[PDB]
Design a protein around this ligand. Sequence first.
Ligand SMILES: [Zn+2]
Length: 37
Amino acid sequence: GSSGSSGRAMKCPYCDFYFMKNGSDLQRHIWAHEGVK
Ligand SMILES: [Zn+2]
């Protein structure tokens, strides 16, 4: 699919959104649900 040739991405511990299993942007996306500036 458009997110990757084999699919099977990780899913967020707070919402419906997806990232690559070792992506650094996931840590910022989670810290944003935890309310960090
Ligand atoms: Zn999320």
